[model samples]
Target: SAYDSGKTIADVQKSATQRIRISHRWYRGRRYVDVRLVVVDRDGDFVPTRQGISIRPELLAQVIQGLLLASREG
Candidate 1:
């Protein structure tokens, strides 16, 4: 996960040559929330972009675990 406008960049790379991006957005009235998760292969691209991705915490956790596992192997 990365933030071009923020100070932190979360790397969360797995050995699978996949890059996962998790973005967070905090609003005045809204909870500090996850705004996006992008999975990009080693091709230097986003697997899913432009289209909309809804928030799914349970699935996101699993995906994150996969990402971490891949990174560890790499």
Candidate 2:
């Protein structure tokens, strides 16, 4: 479940080999953001796999909020 994959926002920022990508995707007649975490393989290739979190849009919004909070200078 996606809830299991949740981590402290700082952990994500400390990882050096992961990438975050957001793209627009449509399903049926609706549009949504397609967020992905592409990992660099042993050979340094960006690959997408099914072994990771697939978060709902609302959930991702919360994750993004946490990440933004980490960026604040306080």
Candidate 3:
């Protein structure tokens, strides 16, 4: 958006139709909170755009590190 003439209101609306939601799921008989990336359809229903994964401790640590590194960058 900072370059290429930037995006319009309609462009923002199109991409804003969907939102990510988090919920609990059962995996291998264990409960884990997973994030769901979903989009809304014509019928106003939530549809998953892609499959998500359970955020275990190791994965969480990696994500934290990656985010910290990203923040240190431009």
Tens-place lDDT digits, model 3, residues 1-74: 11112121121223556655555545577656555555666444656555554575447678778889999997
The per-model lDDT (C-alpha) reads 0.48, 0.51, 0.51
For candidate 2, the TM-score is: 0.39
Clashing pairs in 1: 1-22, 13-71, 14-70, 14-71, 15-70, 15-71
Off by over 4 Å in 3: 1-15, 31-33, 51-55
The per-residue C-alpha lDDT of model 1 at residue 54 equals: 42
RMSD of each: 7.7, 8.8, 11.7
The worst-scoring run of ten residues by lDDT in candidate 3 lies at 1-10
> Quick one: best TM-score, which candidate?
3
* Pairs that clash in candidate 2: none
User: Comparing 1 and 2 by TM-score, which wins?
Assistant: 2
lDDT of 2 at 62: 88
Q: What lDDT score is found at residue 29 in candidate 1?
A: 45
Q: Lowest summed-lDDT stretch of 10 residues in model 1?
A: 1-10
> Model 2, residue 7: displacement in angstroms?
26
TM-score, structure 3 vs. true: 0.50
